[PDB]
Structures are given as C-alpha cells and as structure tokens.
Amino acid sequence: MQYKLILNGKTLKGETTTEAVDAATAEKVFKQYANDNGVXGEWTYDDATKTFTVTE
C-alpha cells in the first residue's frame, strides 16, 4: 500500500512516499503535493515498483 513519487522538476529533484489503498488516491495525494511544490509536468506510472514520476 506504499507508493513513491519521483520529482524531476526544473529546480526540484527528489522522492517522497505515501501510504494509500488506491492508485487514484495516491496519484491525487502526489498531485496535490506536487502542485504545492509548484509542479503541475508529465506524469509516468510504474506499477511494478509502485512509483509515480513527474517530468516537468
């Protein structure tokens, strides 16, 4: 139930984590987080390692 976020912004590179029971819930949380950090970017999703990647 853990999901990662890989931030590749023009001035913001990093990775965060959250615990969510649904991929859309996790995506929404990460999108909110990204937006608060100024990002949103092109969003890619890997379901093998449960990671969302943002390419600004």
Side-chain angles (χ1 to χ4, degrees):
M1 291 302 185
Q2 299 190 30
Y3 273 91
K4 292 179 180 185
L5 174 70
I6 294 174
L7 292 172
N8 272 332
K10 309 181 186 307
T11 184
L12 179 71
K13 173 182 175 181
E15 58 181 270
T16 53
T17 49
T18 196
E19 186 168 85
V21 300
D22 183 85
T25 307
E27 186 183 291
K28 185 181 186 301
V29 174
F30 284 145
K31 187 55 165 58
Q32 181 186 271
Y33 187 89
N35 277 93
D36 188 87
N37 279 269
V39 177
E42 305 302 289
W43 288 66
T44 46
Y45 177 53
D46 175 88
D47 62 286
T49 53
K50 288 65 181 294
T51 303
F52 292 87
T53 305
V54 201
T55 316
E56 187 179 67

